[PDB]
Amino acid sequence: RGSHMTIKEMPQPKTFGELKNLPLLNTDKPVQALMKIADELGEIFKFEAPGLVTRFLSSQRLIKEACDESRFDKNLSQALKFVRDFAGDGLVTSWTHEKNWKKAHNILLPSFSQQAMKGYHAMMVDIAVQLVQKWERLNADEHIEVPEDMTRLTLDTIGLCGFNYRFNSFYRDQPHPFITSMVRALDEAMNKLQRANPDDPAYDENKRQFQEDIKVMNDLVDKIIADRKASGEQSDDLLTHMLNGKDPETGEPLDDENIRYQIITFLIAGHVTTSGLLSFALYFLVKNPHVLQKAAEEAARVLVDPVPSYKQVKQLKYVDMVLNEALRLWPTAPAFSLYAKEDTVLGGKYPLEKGDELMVLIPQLHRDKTIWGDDVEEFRPERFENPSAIPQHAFKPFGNGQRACPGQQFALHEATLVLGMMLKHFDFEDHTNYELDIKETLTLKPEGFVVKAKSKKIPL
């Protein structure tokens, strides 16, 4: 009943005196570690660290409440507070109440309109064609390093649709320097929070390396802008709105400083997670041959022209289901954080004070046997045939509310287009019997996943 229930004590994993649980994050796979703890302690547990108290939730029951924007706003997890050192008050790393969140949210959203989207398509195809031709052009016994390639595609794509700028990742056999520095900057951000003594001079090489990478990323931004300054455009894209658009509420455009932060934020946000998704989707597909056949058969049946049209991607009802079923198991942005607007009580049993933080552990949420069934670890896209059979807030890979992913249609449309084309033009083989090894650079990816494609010989 309403509150008939009585105060339950909040489970908590081993503490270590005055560092609390911080030692449990001694691992290069903290999300995976936290999933193990939630397996032990169930739907909710406290997790402290010097200058940090948060609460991890893993049940649809509790996340439903947490996602109630009348009761909880978006919080910056410690992870995001650190990433903020180089992503500034760009969209992902600003607070809802901060002036530049609202300003930029208003100025930029048009870039994700239906009309905008229809125009990104031809460019997505441009890049998608490159990926395919790269794979068409491999010799026999040569293999595909899947995440390195998905990253080439997704970064080239955001670069082109967002900024009219070509990274030409497919013309490099190593990763683009941006990617390299991004990864290091991100991996440092994650490390700064397993650290009890941030100022210990053993970390002074890290610090210097961090500024080195940040300069690398900014020099790319410099290039991106100069290239825009030096031309007449066709483009009406993200960058156009960043440089020229004015807030409807104030009449002001973004300042140069914040513009530089949005560019970094979109370069990262706009590829990183989508690459993870495409890498995971491909994984589950080769690991579940019968599912691949069904998807490949939809591709063949739907993608009848040499290159796909916007309308055709939308007809790929089953590939879409595959993508969603990949996000369910390994949501490439694996957490987001909320705080209580007022003193309250969550789920009838656990009181919170104003300001108290929560963290939605998305991989655990997506594994709630109440919601999905027993076979929770089984990859099965068919769970998505009926959108109404999935409760609200049971499936949340794009976050929640005002601060939900504005890039979601962009991302699925890209992934759907590319996966479709892959399935249409290749037969795949898990020649190594790859063992899944998930790397966490603050987002997730299947590290070292490799496959062999065999061309179906369909011309482009």
Ligand code: HEM
């Ligand atoms: C599979 C692909 C993607 C996934 C899984 C994903 C996931 C998410 C999640 C969970 C959040 C919420 C963050 C939070 O509440 O702390 C978010 C925010 C955001 N995403 Fe995505 N996203 C994807 C694709 C994209 C793309 C393609 C773009 C841009 C082209 C993008 C741009 C952003 C931005 C700007 C935010 C912050 C928006 C705001 O808070 O105002 N994302 N994303």
